[PDB]
Every structure is written in C-alpha cells, then in structure tokens.
Tab-separated table of N, CA and C in Angstrom:
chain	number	residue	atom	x	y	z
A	1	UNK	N	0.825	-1.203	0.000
A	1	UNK	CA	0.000	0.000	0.000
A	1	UNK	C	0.862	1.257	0.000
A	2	UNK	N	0.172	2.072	0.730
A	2	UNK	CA	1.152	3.640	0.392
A	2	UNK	C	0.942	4.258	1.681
A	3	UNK	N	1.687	5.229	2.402
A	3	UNK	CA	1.917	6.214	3.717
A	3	UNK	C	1.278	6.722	3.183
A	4	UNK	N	0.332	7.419	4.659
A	4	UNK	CA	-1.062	8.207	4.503
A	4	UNK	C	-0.770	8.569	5.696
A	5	UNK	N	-1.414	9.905	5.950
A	5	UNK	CA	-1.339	10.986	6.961
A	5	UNK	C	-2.625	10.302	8.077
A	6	UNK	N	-2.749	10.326	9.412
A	6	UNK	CA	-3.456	9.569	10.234
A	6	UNK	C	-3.229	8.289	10.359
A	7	UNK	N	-1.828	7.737	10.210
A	7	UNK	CA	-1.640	6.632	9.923
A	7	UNK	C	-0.797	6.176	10.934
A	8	UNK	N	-0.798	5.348	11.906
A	8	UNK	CA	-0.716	5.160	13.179
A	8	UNK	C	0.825	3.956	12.857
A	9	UNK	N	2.100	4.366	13.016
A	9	UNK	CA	3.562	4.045	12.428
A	9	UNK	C	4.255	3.657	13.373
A	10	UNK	N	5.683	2.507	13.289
A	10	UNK	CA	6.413	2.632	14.096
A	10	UNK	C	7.734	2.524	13.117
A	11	UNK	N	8.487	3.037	13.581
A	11	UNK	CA	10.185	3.427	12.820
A	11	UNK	C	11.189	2.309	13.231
A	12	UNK	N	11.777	2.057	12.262
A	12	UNK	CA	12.250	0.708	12.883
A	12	UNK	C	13.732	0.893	11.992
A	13	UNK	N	14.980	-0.255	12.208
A	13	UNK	CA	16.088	0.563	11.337
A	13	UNK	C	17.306	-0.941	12.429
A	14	UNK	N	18.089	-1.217	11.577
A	14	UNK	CA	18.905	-2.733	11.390
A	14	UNK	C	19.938	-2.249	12.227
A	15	UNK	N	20.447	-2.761	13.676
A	15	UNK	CA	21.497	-2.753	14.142
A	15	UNK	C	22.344	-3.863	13.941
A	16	UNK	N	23.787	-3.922	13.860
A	16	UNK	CA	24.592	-4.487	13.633
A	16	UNK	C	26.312	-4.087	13.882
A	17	UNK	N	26.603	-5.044	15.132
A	17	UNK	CA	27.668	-4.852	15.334
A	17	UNK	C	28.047	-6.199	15.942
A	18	UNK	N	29.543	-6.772	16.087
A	18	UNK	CA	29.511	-7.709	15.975
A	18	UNK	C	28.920	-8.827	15.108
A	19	UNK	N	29.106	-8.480	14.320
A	19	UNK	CA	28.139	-9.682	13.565
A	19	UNK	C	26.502	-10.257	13.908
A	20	UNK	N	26.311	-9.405	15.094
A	20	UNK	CA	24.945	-9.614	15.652
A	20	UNK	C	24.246	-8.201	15.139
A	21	UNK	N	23.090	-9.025	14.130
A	21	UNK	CA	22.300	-8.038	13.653
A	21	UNK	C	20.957	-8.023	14.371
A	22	UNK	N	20.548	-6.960	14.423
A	22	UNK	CA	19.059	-6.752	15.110
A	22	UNK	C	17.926	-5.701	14.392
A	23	UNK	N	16.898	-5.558	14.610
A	23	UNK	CA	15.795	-4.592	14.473
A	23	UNK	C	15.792	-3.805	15.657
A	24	UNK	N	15.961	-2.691	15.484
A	24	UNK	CA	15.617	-1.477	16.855
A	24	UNK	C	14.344	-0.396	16.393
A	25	UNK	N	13.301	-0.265	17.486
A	25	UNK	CA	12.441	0.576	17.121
A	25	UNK	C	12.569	1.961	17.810
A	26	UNK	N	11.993	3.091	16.900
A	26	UNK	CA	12.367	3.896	17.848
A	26	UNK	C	11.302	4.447	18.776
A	27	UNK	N	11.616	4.893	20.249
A	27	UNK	CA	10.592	4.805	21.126
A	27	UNK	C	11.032	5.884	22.023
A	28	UNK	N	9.621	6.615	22.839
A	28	UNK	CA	9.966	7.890	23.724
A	28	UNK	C	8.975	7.492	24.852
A	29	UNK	N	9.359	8.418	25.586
A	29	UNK	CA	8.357	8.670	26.746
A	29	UNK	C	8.212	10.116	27.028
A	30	UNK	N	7.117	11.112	27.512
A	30	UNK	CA	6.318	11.736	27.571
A	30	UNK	C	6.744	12.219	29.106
A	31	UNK	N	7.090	11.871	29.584
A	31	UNK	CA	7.137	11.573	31.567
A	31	UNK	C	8.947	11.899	31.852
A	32	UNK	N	8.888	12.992	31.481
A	32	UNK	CA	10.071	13.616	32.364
A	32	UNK	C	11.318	13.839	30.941
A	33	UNK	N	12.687	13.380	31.153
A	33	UNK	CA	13.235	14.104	29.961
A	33	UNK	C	12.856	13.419	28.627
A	34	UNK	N	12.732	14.305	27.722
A	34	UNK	CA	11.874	14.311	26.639
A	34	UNK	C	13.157	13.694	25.386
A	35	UNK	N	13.514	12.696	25.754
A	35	UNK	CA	14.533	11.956	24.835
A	35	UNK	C	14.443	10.857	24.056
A	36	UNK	N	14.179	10.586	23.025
A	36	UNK	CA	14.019	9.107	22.345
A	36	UNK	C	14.993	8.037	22.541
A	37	UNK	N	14.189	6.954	22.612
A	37	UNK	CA	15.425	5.868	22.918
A	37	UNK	C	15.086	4.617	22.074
A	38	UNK	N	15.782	3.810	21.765
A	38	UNK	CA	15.309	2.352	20.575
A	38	UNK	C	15.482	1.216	21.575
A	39	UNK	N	14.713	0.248	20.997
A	39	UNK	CA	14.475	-1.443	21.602
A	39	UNK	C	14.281	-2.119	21.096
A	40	UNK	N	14.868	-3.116	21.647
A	40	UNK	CA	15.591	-4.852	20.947
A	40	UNK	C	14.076	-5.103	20.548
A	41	UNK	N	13.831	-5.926	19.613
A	41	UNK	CA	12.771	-6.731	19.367
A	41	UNK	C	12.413	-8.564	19.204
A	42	UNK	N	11.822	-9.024	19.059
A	42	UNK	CA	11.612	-10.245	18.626
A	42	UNK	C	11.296	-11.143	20.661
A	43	UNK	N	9.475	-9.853	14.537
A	43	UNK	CA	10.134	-8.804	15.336
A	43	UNK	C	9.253	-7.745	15.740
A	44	UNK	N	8.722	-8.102	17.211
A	44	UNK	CA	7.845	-6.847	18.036
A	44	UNK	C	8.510	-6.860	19.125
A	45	UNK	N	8.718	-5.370	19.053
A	45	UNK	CA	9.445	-4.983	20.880
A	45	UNK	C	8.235	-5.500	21.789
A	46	UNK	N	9.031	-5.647	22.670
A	46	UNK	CA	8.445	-5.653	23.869
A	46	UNK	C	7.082	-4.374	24.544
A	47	UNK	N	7.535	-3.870	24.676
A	47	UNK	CA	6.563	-2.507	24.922
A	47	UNK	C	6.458	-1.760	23.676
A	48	UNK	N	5.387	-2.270	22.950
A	48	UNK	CA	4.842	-1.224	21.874
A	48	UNK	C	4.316	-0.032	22.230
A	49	UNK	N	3.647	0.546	22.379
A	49	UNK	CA	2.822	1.135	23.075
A	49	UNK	C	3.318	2.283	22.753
A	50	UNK	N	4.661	2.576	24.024
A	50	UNK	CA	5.482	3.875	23.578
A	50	UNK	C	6.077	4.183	22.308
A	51	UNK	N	6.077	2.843	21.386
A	51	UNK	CA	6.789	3.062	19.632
A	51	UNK	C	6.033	2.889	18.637
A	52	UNK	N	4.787	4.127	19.279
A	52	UNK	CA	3.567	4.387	17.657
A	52	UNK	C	3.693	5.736	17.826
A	53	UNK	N	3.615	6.123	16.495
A	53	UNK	CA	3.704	7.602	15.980
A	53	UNK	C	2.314	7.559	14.922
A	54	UNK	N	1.968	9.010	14.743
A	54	UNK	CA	1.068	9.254	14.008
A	54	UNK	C	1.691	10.305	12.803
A	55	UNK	N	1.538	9.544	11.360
A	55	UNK	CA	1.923	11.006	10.177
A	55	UNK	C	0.776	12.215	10.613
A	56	UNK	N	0.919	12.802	10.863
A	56	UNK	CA	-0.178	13.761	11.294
A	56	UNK	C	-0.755	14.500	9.949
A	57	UNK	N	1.027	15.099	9.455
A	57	UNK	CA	0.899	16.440	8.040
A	57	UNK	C	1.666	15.520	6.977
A	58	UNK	N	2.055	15.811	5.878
A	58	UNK	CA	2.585	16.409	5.046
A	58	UNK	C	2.498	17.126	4.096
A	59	UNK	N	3.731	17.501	3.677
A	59	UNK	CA	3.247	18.941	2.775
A	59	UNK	C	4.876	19.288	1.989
A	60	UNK	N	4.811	20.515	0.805
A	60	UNK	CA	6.093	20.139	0.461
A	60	UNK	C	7.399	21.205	1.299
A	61	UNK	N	8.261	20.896	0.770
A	61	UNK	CA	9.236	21.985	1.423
A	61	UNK	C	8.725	23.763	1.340
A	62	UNK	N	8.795	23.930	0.188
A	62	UNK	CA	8.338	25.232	-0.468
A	62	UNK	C	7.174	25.415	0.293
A	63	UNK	N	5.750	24.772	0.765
A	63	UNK	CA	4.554	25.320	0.732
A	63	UNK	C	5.032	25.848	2.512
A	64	UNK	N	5.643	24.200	3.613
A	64	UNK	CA	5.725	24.563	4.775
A	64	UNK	C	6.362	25.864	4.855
A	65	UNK	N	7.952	25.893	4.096
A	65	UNK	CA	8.225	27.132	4.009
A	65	UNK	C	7.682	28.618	3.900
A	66	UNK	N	7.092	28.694	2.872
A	66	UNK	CA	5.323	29.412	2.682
A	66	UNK	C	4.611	30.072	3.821
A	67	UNK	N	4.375	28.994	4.363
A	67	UNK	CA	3.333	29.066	5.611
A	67	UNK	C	4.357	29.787	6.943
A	68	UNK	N	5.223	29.374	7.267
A	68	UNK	CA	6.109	29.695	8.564
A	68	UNK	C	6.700	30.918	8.283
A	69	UNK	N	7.172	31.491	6.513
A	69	UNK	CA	6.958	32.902	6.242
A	69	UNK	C	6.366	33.871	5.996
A	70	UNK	N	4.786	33.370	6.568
A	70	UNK	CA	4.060	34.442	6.508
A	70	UNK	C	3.958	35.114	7.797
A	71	UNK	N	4.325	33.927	8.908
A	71	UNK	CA	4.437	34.417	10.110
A	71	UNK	C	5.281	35.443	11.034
A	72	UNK	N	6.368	35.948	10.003
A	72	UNK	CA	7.415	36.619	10.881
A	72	UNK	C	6.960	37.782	10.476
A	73	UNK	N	-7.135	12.084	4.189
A	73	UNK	CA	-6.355	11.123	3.987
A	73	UNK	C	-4.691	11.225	2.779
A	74	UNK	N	-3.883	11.775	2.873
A	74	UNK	CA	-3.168	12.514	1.696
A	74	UNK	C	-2.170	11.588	1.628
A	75	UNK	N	-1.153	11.205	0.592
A	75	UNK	CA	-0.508	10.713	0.670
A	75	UNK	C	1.058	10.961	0.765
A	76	UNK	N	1.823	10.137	1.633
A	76	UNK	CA	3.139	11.000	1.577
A	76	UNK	C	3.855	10.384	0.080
A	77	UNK	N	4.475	11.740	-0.159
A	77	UNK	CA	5.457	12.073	-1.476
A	77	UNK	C	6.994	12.373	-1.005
A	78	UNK	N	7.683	11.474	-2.050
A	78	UNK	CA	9.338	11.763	-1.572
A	78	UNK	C	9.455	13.228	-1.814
A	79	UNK	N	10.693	13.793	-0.720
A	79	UNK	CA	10.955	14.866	-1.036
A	79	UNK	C	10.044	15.695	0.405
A	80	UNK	N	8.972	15.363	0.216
A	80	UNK	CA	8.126	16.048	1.594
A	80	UNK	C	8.569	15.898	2.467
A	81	UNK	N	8.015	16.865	3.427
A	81	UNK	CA	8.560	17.289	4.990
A	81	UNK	C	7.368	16.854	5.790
A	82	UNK	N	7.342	16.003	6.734
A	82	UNK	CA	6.187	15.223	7.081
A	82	UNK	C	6.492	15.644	9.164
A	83	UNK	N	5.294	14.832	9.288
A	83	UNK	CA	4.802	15.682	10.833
A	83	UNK	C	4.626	14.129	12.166
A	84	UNK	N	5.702	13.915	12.823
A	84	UNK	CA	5.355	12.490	13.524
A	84	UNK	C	5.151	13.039	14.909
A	85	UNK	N	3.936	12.620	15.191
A	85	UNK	CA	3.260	12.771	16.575
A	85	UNK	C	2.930	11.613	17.280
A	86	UNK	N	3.165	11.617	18.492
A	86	UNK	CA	4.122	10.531	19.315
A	86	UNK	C	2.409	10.019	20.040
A	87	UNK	N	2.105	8.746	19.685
A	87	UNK	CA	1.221	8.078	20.290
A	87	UNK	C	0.838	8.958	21.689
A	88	UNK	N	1.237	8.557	22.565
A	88	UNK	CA	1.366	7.910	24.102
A	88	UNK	C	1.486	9.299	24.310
A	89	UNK	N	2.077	10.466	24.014
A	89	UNK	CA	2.409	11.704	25.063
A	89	UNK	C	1.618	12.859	24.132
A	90	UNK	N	1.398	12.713	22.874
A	90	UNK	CA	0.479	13.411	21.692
A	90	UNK	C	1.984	14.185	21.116
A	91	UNK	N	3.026	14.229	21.752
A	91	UNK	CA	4.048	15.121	21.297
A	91	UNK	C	4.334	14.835	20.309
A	92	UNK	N	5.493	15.655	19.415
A	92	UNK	CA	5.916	15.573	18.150
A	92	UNK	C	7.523	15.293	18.353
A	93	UNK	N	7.904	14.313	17.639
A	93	UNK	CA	9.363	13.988	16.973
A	93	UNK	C	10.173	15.090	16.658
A	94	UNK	N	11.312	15.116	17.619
A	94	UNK	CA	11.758	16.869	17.166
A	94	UNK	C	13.054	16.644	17.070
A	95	UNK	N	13.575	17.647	16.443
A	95	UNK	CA	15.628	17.875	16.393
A	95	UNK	C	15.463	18.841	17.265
A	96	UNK	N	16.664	18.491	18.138
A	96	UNK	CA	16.623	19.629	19.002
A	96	UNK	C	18.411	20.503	19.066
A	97	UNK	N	18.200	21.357	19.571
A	97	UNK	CA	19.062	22.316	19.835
A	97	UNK	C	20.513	21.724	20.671
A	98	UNK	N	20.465	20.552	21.788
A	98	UNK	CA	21.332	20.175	22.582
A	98	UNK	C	21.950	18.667	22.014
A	99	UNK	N	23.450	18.688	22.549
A	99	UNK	CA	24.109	17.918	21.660
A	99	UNK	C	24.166	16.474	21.775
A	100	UNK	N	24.245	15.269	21.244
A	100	UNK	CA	24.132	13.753	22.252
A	100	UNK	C	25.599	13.896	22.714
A	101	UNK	N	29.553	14.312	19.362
A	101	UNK	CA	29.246	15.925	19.825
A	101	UNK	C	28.613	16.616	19.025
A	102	UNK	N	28.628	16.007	17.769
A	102	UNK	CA	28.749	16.775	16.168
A	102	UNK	C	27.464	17.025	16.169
A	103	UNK	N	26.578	15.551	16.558
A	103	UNK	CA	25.231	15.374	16.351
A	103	UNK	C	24.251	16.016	17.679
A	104	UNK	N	23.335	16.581	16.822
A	104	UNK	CA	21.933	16.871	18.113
A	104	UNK	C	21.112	16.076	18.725
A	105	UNK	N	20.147	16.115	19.569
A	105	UNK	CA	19.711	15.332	20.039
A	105	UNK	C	18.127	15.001	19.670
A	106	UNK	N	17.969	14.028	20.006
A	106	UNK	CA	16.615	13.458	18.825
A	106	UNK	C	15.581	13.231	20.250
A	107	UNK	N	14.114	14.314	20.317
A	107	UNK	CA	13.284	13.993	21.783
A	107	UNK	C	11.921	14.441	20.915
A	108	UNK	N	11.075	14.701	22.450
A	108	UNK	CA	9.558	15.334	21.859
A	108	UNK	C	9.578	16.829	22.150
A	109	UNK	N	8.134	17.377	21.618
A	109	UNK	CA	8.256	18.429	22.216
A	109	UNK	C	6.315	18.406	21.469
A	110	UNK	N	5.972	20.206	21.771
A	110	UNK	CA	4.312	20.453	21.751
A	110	UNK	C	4.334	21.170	20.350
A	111	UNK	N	5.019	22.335	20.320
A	111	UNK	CA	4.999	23.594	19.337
A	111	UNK	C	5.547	22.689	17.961
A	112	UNK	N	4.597	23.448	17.229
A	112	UNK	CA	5.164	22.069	16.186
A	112	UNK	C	5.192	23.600	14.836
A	113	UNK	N	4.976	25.085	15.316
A	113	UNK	CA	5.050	26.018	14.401
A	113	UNK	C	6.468	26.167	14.531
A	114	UNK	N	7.377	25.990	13.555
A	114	UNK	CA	8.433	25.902	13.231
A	114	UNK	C	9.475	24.310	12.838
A	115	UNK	N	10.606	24.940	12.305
A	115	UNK	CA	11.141	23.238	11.418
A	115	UNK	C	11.538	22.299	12.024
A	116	UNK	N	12.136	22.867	13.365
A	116	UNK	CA	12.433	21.987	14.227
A	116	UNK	C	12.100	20.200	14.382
A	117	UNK	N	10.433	20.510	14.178
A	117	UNK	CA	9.383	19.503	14.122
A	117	UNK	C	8.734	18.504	12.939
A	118	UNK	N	10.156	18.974	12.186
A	118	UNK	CA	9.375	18.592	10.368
A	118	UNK	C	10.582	17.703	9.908
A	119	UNK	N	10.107	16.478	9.143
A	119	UNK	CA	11.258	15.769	8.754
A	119	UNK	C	11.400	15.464	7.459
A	120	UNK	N	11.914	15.770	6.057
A	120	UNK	CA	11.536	15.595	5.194
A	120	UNK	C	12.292	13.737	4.934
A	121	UNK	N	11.366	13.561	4.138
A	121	UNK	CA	11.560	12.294	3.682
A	121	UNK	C	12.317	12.005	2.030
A	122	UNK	N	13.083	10.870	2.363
A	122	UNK	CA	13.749	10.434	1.067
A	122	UNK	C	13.752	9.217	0.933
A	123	UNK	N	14.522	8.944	-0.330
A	123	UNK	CA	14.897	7.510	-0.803
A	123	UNK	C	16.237	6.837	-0.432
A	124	UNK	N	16.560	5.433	-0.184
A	124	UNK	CA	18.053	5.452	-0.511
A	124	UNK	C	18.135	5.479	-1.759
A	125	UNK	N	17.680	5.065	-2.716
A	125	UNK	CA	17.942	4.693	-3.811
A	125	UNK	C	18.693	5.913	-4.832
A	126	UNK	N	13.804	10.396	-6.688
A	126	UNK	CA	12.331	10.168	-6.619
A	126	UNK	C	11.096	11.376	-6.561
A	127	UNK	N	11.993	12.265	-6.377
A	127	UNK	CA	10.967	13.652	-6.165
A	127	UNK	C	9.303	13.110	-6.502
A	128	UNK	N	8.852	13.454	-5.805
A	128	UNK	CA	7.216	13.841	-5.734
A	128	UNK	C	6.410	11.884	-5.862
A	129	UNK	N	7.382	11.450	-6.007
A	129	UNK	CA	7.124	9.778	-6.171
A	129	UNK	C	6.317	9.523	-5.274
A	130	UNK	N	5.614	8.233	-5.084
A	130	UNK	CA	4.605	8.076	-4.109
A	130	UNK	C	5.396	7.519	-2.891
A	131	UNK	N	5.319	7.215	-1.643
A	131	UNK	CA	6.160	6.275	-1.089
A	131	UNK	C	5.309	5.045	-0.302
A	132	UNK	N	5.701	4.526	-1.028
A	132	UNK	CA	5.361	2.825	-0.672
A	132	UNK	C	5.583	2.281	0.383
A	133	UNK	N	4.788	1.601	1.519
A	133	UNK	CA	5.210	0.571	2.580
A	133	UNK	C	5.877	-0.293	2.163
A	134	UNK	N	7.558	-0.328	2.853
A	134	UNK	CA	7.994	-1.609	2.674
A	134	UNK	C	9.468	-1.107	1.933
A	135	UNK	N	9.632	0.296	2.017
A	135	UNK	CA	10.677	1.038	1.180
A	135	UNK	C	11.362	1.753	2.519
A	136	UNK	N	12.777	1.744	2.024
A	136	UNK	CA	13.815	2.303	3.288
A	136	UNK	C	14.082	3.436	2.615
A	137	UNK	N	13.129	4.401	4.246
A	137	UNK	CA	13.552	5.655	4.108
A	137	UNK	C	14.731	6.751	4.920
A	138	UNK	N	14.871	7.755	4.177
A	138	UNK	CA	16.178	8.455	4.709
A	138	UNK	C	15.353	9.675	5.259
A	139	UNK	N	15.678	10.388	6.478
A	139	UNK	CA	14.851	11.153	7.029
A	139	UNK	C	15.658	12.511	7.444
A	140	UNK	N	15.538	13.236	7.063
A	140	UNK	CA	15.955	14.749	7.215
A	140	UNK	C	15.169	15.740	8.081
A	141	UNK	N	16.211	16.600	8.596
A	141	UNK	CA	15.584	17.215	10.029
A	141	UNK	C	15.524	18.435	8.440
A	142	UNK	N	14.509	19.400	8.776
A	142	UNK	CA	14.263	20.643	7.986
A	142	UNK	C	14.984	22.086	8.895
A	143	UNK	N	15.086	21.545	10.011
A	143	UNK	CA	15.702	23.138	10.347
A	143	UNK	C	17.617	22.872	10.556
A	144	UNK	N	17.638	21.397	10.921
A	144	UNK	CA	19.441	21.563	10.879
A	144	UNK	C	19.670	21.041	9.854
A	145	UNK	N	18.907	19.718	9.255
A	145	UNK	CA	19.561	19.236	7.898
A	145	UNK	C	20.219	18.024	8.445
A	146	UNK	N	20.579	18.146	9.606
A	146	UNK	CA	20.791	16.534	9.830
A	146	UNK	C	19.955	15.385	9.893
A	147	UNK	N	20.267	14.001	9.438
A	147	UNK	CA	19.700	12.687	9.404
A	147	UNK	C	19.462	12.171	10.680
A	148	UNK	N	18.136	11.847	10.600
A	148	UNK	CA	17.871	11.048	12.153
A	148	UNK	C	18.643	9.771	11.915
A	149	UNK	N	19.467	8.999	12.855
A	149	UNK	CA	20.916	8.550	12.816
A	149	UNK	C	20.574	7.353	13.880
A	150	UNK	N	21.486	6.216	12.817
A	150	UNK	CA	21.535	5.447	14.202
A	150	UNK	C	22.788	5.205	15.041
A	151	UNK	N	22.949	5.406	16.541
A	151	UNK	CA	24.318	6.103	17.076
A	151	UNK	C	24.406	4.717	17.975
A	152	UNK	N	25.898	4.473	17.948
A	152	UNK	CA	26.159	3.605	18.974
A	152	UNK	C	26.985	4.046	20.103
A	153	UNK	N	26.824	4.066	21.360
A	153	UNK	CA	27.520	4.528	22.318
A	153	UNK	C	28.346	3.412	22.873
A	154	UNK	N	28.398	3.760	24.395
A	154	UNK	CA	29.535	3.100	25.095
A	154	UNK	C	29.082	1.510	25.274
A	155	UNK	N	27.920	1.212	24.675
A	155	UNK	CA	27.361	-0.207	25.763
A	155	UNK	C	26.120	-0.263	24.747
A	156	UNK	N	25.439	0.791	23.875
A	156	UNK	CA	23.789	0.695	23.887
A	156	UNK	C	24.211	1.681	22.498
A	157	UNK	N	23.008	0.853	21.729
A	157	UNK	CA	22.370	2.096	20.436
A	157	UNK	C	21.574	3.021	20.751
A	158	UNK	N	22.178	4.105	20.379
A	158	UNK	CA	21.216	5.246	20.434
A	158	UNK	C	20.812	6.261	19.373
A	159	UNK	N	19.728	7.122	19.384
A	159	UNK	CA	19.266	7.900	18.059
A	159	UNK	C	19.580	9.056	18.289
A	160	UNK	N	20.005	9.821	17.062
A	160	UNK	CA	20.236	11.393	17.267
A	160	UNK	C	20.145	12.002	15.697
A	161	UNK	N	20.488	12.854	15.561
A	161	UNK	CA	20.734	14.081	14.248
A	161	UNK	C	22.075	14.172	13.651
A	162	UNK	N	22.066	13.742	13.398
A	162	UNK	CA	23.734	13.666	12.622
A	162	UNK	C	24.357	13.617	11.147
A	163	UNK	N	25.871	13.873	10.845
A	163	UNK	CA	25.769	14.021	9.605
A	163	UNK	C	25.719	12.884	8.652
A	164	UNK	N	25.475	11.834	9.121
A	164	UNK	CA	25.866	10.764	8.366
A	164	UNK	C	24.041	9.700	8.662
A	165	UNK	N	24.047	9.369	7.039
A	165	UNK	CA	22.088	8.800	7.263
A	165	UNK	C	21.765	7.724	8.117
A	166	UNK	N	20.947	6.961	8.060
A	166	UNK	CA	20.508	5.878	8.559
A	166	UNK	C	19.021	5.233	7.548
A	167	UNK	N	19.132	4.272	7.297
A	167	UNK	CA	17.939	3.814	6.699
A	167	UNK	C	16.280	2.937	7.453
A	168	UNK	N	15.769	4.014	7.759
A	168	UNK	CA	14.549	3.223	8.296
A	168	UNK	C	13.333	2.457	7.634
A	169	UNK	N	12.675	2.099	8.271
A	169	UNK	CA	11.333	1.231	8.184
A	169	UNK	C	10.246	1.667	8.714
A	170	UNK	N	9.225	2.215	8.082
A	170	UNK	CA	8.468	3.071	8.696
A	170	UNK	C	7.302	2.273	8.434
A	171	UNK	N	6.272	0.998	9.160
A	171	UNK	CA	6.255	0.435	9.383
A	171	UNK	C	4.798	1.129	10.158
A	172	UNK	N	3.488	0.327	9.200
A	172	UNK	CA	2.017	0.289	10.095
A	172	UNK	C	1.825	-0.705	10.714
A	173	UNK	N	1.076	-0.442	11.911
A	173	UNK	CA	0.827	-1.040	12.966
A	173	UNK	C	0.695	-1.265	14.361
C-alpha cells in the first residue's frame, strides 16, 4: 500500500555490530526528559505502546516554508517534509538544539510552528514519487539538515541528528 497521513507508524532501522544483527524501534516517553530511545525486538518490541507515531501532516518543502513565512487522507510524497506525533504523550518527533558531539539530540516536544518539528523524507535509492510501505527511508531534520541517525555509544544504540544517514522502516501497525 502507500503512507497516509493519520496513519498510526512505528520506525524501525537494522542494528549491527559484531556480527549480531538486530531490528531497533524507535521509542519515547512523555514523563520527564523528553529523549528518544530504541528497543531490541523479537520482530515486536516488547513494549509497543510507547513506539507508535502518528503522520499527522505532510506537505512540500516550499509550501511549509510558505506558511512559517508568513508568520514573521493525503498521501506521503518523496521529497516532503512530514509531521510524527508521538502516540502515548500526543508530542511531536523533534531535532533539538542540545548535543548527544557533532550530532543533536533526537526527543519530543508540543509547538510544532516551526522546522524543528518537520522531517523531510527520502529515498536510498524520486521527487514527488509516491512512497510505498515496505521502502527504506532516509529522514531529514528541515531546520538543521541533519539525518535522524543510528548512534552507537559506550554499551547501547542510540538515536540522534547527525551528519551521516541511517535507513529506516516506517512500518504500520
């Protein structure tokens, strides 16, 4: 089928190190610091619940642009800047300002007037193309331009904004 706006999603994206490969979804909580975090699966995490998002918008670069400069069922299209609102807390998927060094940090937040909150979507491989369930997408923050990323730390994978992509699975259900 095809991504549609009201469409109740979870983001999902291949860890691998050691030769041990996995599915990680990505997942937040609402209840104190406002930080996204991913989980092991199997492939269903454990606690779904917190790792559904809703496409709320999309729309294209130029029009959001449009709209945020006047201020001073649809389907998603590559190239668009799209709107993920977080099940469980109603918040929105945001790039934020503070660092995880290079890369920013990936949480929720309410205010969704401005880019902060907007992610445009790509291909690995499309402008205005339809995008299909079941296709790995590349996801762009609209106000820094960095890729929501998959980061490995000292012990644990983690998600952030960074310069280098990551390929997800954006994934109904």
């Amino acid at each position: 089928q095809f991504l549609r706006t009201d469409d109740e999603v979870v983001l999902q994206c291949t860890a691998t190190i050691h030769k041990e490969q996995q599915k990680l979804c990505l997942a937040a909580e609402g209840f104190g610091n406002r930080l996204c975090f991913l989980e092991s699966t199997s492939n269903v995490p454990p606690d779904l619940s917190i790792c559904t998002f809703v496409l709320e918008q999309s729309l294209s670069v130029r029009a959001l642009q449009e709209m945020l400069a006047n201020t001073v069922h649809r389907t998603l299209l590559y190239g668009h800047a799209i709107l993920l609102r977080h099940s469980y807390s109603g918040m929105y998927l945001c790039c934020l300002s503070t660092s995880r060094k290079l890369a920013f940090d990936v949480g929720l937040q309410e205010d969704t007037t401005g880019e902060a909150c907007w992610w445009t979507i790509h291909s690995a491989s499309s402008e205005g193309e339809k995008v299909r369930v079941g296709d790995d997408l590349i996801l762009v923050s609209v106000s820094s331009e960095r890729y929501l990323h998959l980061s490995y730390g000292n012990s644990s994978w983690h998600v952030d904004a960074a310069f280098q992509q990551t390929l997800w699975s954006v994934a109904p259900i």
